[PDB]
Structures are given as C-alpha cells and as structure tokens.
Amino acid sequence: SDVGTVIQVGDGIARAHGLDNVMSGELVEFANGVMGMALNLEENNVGIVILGPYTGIKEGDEVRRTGRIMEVPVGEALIGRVVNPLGQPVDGLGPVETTETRPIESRAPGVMDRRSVHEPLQTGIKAIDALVPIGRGQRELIIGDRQTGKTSVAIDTIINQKDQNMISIYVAIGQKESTVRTVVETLRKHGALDYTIVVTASASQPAPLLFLAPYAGVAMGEYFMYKGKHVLVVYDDLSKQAAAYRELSLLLRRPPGREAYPGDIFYLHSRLLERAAKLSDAKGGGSLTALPFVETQAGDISAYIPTNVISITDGQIFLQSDLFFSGVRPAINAGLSVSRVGGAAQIKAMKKVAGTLRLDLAAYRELEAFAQFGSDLDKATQAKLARGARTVEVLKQDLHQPIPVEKQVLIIYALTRGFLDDIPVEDVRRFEKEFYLFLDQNGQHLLEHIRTTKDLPNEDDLNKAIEAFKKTFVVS
C-alpha cells in the first residue's frame, strides 16, 4: 500500500515502516498535514526528512506519499509576493494561483547550449559599473565581512534594474525577519516590487527548508529563463546554507572532512551555481545572472568555503572592512577584484574612457603606501596623489540612488581629462551633482547620443558643455 507508520521522530528526521512503492526523492505528507522528502530507501524502513515543524509528529502516525518528485510551483502570478522556499504564501493576500510546477533537480544547460556574454548589467554604482563590469549570465561572487554594505549593493542593483527587462528573484537564507520586512518595505517605496519575487527562509525554520531555499529560488528563475526572459538571482548568503547542510548531514551520521563540513559541499554549491548561464541564440537567448554572498571571518580569503566558491565563480568582488569603516561607501579593493567576462559586455564608451581609471586607482593605492612612508615628494608624484584622491572622491556612491550609465560616462570622462584640478577635494562631491543637473536641463543631446549610439559623441561640443558648467559652478 501507499500508507506507512512512522516509528521514529527526532530533530527533523523520521523513519517509517511500509511504503513499498515509494520512489527516492518523493514527497510524503504526514497525517498532520506537513510533508517531507524521502532521502533514503532501505530493505524495510524508508528514511524521511521533515520540511516543516516536527513537534506534532508522533510514533504511530500514518504518513502518505504525494506521488511526485520535489516540485516548486511557478508562474507570473508570483511576481510581487513573498513566499517560503516551498511554494506556500507567507504574506497573506490570498493564495498564489500559480500556473505550473518545476522540479528542483533540473539538468543544467550543457556545452554548446551557451554563448559568450554580450549584454551588460547596470548596477548603477560608479565603482562596480566602471572598474569591475559584470555581464548578464556571469556569476559574480561577492565576498566580505559583516557590516560592509553588501546588501546595500544588492538592493542598489535590484532598484536600478527598473527600465531594463529583468525579472529579479531575491532569496534570503536564515536572515533575521526584521531585516527581510525592512527590505520589502524599502523595495515597495521605490516601486521595485512589481517585477521582483522574494523567497526567504529564516533562522527559526528547520534546516531542510534552509537547504532547500536557494534551489527553489533558482527553480523559480528557470521557468522565466525558458520563455526567454532575462533573470537575476541574488543569494543573501551561501555560508549559512553550508552550515544548515552541515547540521543535516551530521544529524544523519555521515563522517565529516576538512574543517567540519562533509565532502558533498563542492557538489552542493557547484550544482546550484552551474544552472545560471547565458543561453545561445538557438535556445532563445535567455540569461540568468547570479550574485551569491559568502561571509569571511576577519576578512581572510584563504578558507575552505570561500576558496571552494571562488573555484566556481566567474569573478570576485572583495569588500574591504577597514575601508568601509573609514567612510568610503561602498568598499571595494582594486587589487583583488577582477572579472573574467568583463570587457565583453560593457558598452563601448565605458571601455573608451573608464579603462584608464582602474590602473590609476591601483597605482595610487600602492603610491599611497609609499607616500605614507615619504614625508618629502617630487611634483609628479604629488600630481599622481592628487589625482588619486579625486578619483577616490568621485567613486563614492549615494545609498539607494543608483546613477544612470550616461551620467557615469560623462562624469568619468570629465575626471579623466583632468578639468577637476582647480576644484577642491570637498567641492568635488557638490560639483558632481551640479554637473549632473546642468547636463540634464541643458545638455540633452549628448545624453541622447550616448543612449542610442553607445559611443562617445563629438568631443568639441562635449568639452564646450562641460566648460559651460565649469563657468556656472562656484568654488567654495
């Protein structure tokens, strides 16, 4: 028969007697109304992992099998909601009314189904867009310690992805519910909720939901990818998912390995990250971009999980702790941050101008150490240091106010050409916004030309307009 009796209950695990026809990976729902995943078969007793609250379970309860593999309902109806990892609404507003369901164990897109990246993703942050560009379909790892502004970067990206067609799915694993509610309210205020889905599992939940969450998120993204919609997925943290799977594994009596995690960590992380890819023209051109998060204690990269994830990512973003504490917002290090696929997605004008800035920033970074040693310096080094200071000033973003790309290229060209030498360091911040406004009200044609052509316009009139703004600006 299809009904069996539970004979053990503990910390989210249960064994059952009977269930002859059960399939591995099937979903089984108890008489309580909660459902579980049958991980292991045995000669006489199936081993069941319980997704929901297990306190109500007792020995002698009868467990039934649904008849299907683990499935997450999907559909356009979900957009603008907040849901559990399993597709059940956790925000009122009535049922989900989804179209269809997708299993969580889909096969990733194989070789020759993909294409090289050619479409950019605008985060709106000057530093990220300029020096470390990211393209649609490129999985970029964001590493940093706590209190470094990572979630600010993710929310700025999601907010900026307003004009561009981008179904952005946001998943938080184990995070504090108060922060989730604050982020949901913040998204509603800026009107980014109509095109985004939030799926979260908090620390209070049992481990099986915590380890199921990110797979359910990427399965949500897969449905939109197949029809050809571009998709962006952001993971609030992968390390806590690793800890949750460590809990589940060691409670199942499986020997650990290096550090304390079992050997399946690489399989677990790589299978999740591999599904994000830029499909080829033949498949339909869909693209899935992932921005995973990992927490590094004391900012050390050399560790099991950080390097394990770095081996999978197509790039890394390193957020410096003390630089963040000094007042620079956001924090990023020129030396350690690199993008492999960068340069093939970034628009032509940015490569035309921004490319010189990164080398200047890194050279200033090292010359800063030498000048810190050196009391007395020659004029050329002084000019280089002043230019570095101005570049550091320009690279400071305002929170929750992403800047369109055209303004970025204009301000960065204005900096690189060197007109800012007269303007004092403090005056530069006000100069940037005044220049933005002057371009907006008066200099429309340059912005339209950059919007359409994707190339730098005629230099003479561009410099004339910049000089006109320099005329209007008053030094402090």
Partner: protein
C-alpha cells in the same frame, strides 16, 4: 497517561519510558516517589521529552539530579511544555527555571496563569517596519551609538568598570519615562548585584515588576539551557496579553550560548565544528528570533547583552555576533579619567533614522565627533614624543576644544544619587544633539574645561562655570 521508567544514564538521563500513548516532543513529565522502605529515597523530578525511539521509548532530559531513580517507578505526563507561571501575580520575585521562587517570601497560588515556554516566533505578517531609535537618556549613547528598538545590543565591558551601574540606569530610565519593565537572567558567578538592584529599583519600585529568573553554574545542563527561554516567556506574556506600550528589556542573550557550551555536553550525539553541537546556529536562532517588534502591541523586546567569551574567530562568538545589531564597549582606561559612563566612540549600525529618514544634523555631528577624537588621539601621541608647545595655533585649538568635548561626555546618573548625592539628569536625544552642536561650533571655547563634567545640558555647563566665579 502513565508510563514506567526503564533506563537511567546520568545527566543525559535517557529514561526510556514504556507508555501507551506517547507525549509529543518538548512535553513535560513529572515523577513522584516516596520512600516505601529504608532503602528507597523519595524524589520529585520534572523531565522534558527530546527524542522518540523505537517502540514506545521516549528519551528525556532531567532538570535535577537523578540519584535515587529506580526502574519500574511510575511517571505521569502533564500534557504541555513546562509551564512557567506568568502574569501580574508573578511580578516582583526571583524564580528558578521550573517556576518556583527561590526566596521563600511567598508561594504562587495554583490559580495563576501558566504558559508554555516553547512558542514559534512571530509570523512575518505581524512584524513592523523598523526605523525608529529608542531614547536612552545617556548623552554618549544618544550621540554616538543609538539603539534600534527591537534589536540586540552588545556591550563588551569587563566586570567592575560600570556594567551594573549602566544596566541599573538603563532599567530605571526605561521604567521612569517609558512604560517598559525589565527582566534579568544570569548564568555566571555570584549575584551580589541582587542587593544593589534591591536598593535602587525597590526605592523606584521597579523591583516589584522585574521578574528575575536564575539558574547558575551549579545546575544541571538542562536548567542552564532553559533558563533564558523562561526569561523570554516572561516578556512574551506582556507583549501578547498586556499589549501595553511597554518597550520592555531582557538582559541576557550570549549567556544562552555560554550555556550552549554545556548544551554540547547535554546532546550526547555526533560532534561537529569544534566539539560544538551541530545545531548551534539553529538552537541560538530559535531564541534570537523570538525577540521582535510587532503590530499586536507596542512592545519592543530590545535587549542589552554582554559577551564573556570575547574571542573573535571562535564559531560560537561568531554565530552570536552575526545576530547583534549595535555594539558598545566599556574600558577601564576611560574609567580612570572619571568620565562616566566609560563608553568610547565605537558604534554599530543605528542608521535607520540618521541619515536614512532625515537625520542630517545628527549624522554630521557624530561624524565630526569621531573625527575630532581620533585627531586628538594622534595629537596626544605627538605631544608625548616631542611636546605640545611646538604645535601650530590652528592645531593647538583642536586639542583645546577636544578637552571640552572629551569631558562633556560624562553624565550624572540617577542611580548614583545614593552615593554621589546628585539628583540625576535625563536628556532627550534631540536636546543632546542640539546642545552638543554648539560645542563643535565653539560657542563656549572660553569656558573652563572643568565645568564640562557630570551635567545634563549645555546651560548647566554655563551656570556651573558661572558658579565657579568667573
């Protein structure tokens, strides 16, 4: 129902009851026994189910010594998790983990309200958007590191540098100006603090409301684990039933992980991490997540927490530290200077209001304060090496103002009235910011530095300087 004992394994107990109809996980079982003959010993014990086994066996954990337990003795199951007595009747006394008062002043009547400890955290539906700052009435706290209500606060201060004075002042203010009551739950060393709190908070009367819960090192692992959850259930009653504008306090979080060090000994299962229980993050999260704001009532369970471990990279301090919201530090060197409270410019988060909402003036003032303090620190470094007299006039003026800024930080606490004799001052946050702004603006550069001590407002500084007969 009724079930008989079959096995005993000391602290993990592992009593394998043979029963007819099993109790759910976390349920309470009570054992009553009498000395039938000379050999047998009377024992009254309570146990909490933690695991089901094959056939009818149900593993349990005992909250007290199991010496004298005999196979075959009958056991009765209550029907619900261990029921703390809570409500108006229970206010104003010190409890054990189970619910009896340790001090024999009185016994709680049977008719009182009793609620289970283990409850799911508030649903996502009932949460509220959190932007507001709780007012502490302490100038430095309201100027450098404000506290977000509903959030966990960390204070890294050694014993004997003002921890007791600081927490007494906090609970006194929160009960004087707000409707909030406090709850304290310790696990470590000796509670000499009981008499200090008795003095001041019984003069204030808040002692009648604060329902302290104590179980310390001498207790078995189970009680040392469940003490913090009893303390939290104390707050849960107020927030759910009372629903008053009581922004109550609970004064221990990490002590649950300090007990979790012994919960690793309580497990008796597969080790993980550095000997820790596998479920460290989950077990701590279950506690931490029950502290929330809500729309059911104006109750924020904001908590001030001390971390004895004080080691950064260790898995348990790191896991606890991930949940913290704001941080504060108490150092003895600042206590040497006579500036009280001995809190330094170290801060964390607290930007929900400033500059998020408007908070322009507050944020700019705080940034200037920290910048001036660090500049004064480096200038002090220079002074010892070579001498202050050689400093330029413009750089000397920075030290000149920095002295006043450093000294203004002191606050004349209300609780200190019984030792110092000062009545004590309470300051609104806006008043703190507005008054301090003039100091940075140099309105009172001419006033002597000694006036800027143990006063609430800038006008008090001016009048003290006048009283010095300028």
């Amino acid at each position: 129902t009724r079930g008989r004992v079959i096995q005993v394994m000391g602290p993990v107990v592992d009593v394998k009851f043979e029963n007819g109809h099993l109790p759910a996980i976390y349920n309470a079982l009570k054992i009553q026994h009498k000395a039938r003959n000379e050999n047998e010993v009377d024992i009254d014990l309570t146990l909490e189910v933690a695991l089901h086994l094959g056939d009818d066996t149900v593993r349990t954990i005992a909250m007290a010594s199991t010496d004298g337990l005999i196979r075959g003795m009958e056991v009765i199951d209550t029907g619900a998790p261990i029921s703390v007595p809570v409500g108006e009747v229970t206010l104003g006394r010190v409890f054990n983990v189970l619910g009896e008062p340790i001090d024999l002043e009185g016994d709680i009547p049977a008719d009182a309200r009793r609620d289970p400890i283990h409850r799911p955290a508030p649903k996502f539906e009932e949460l509220a958007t959190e932007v507001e700052i709780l007012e502490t009435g302490i100038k430095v706290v309201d100027l450098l590191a404000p506290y977000i209500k509903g959030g966990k606060i960390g204070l890294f201060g050694g014993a004997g540098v003002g921890k007791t004075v600081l927490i007494q002042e906090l609970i006194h203010n929160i009960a004087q100006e707000h409707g909030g009551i406090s709850v304290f739950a310790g696990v470590g060393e000796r509670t000499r603090e009981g008499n200090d709190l008795y003095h001041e908070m019984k003069d204030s009367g808040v002692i009648s409301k604060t329902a302290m819960v104590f179980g310390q090192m001498n207790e078995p692992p189970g009680a040392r684990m469940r003490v913090a959850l009893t303390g939290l259930t104390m707050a849960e009653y107020f927030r759910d039933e009372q629903g008053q504008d009581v922004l109550l306090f609970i004064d221990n979080i990490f002590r649950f992980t300090q007990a979790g060090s012994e919960v690793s000994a309580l497990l008796g299962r597969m080790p993980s991490a550095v000997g820790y229980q596998p479920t460290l993050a989950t077990e701590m999260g279950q506690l931490q997540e029950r502290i929330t704001s809500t729309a059911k009532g104006s109750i924020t369970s904001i908590q001030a927490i001390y971390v004895p471990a004080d080691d950064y990279t260790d898995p348990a301090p790191a896991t606890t530290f991930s949940h913290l919201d704001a941080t504060t530090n108490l150092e003895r060197k600042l206590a040497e200077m006579g500036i009280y409270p001995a809190v330094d410019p170290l801060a964390s988060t607290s930007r929900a209001l400033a500059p998020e909402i408007v908070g322009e003036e507050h944020y700019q003032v705080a940034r200037k304060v920290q910048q001036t303090l660090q500049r004064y620190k480096e200038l002090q470094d220079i002074i010892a090496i070579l001498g202050m007299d050689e400093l330029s006039d413009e750089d000397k003026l920075v030290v000149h103002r920095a002295r006043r800024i450093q000294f203004f930080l002191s606050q004349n606490f209300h609780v200190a009235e019984q030792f110092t004799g000062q009545p004590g001052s309470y300051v609104p946050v806006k008043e703190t910011v507005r008054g301090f702004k003039e100091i940075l603006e140099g309105k009172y550069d001419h006033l002597p530095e000694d006036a800027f001590r143990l006063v609430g407002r800038i006008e008090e500084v001016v009048e003290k300087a006048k009283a010095m007969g300028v």
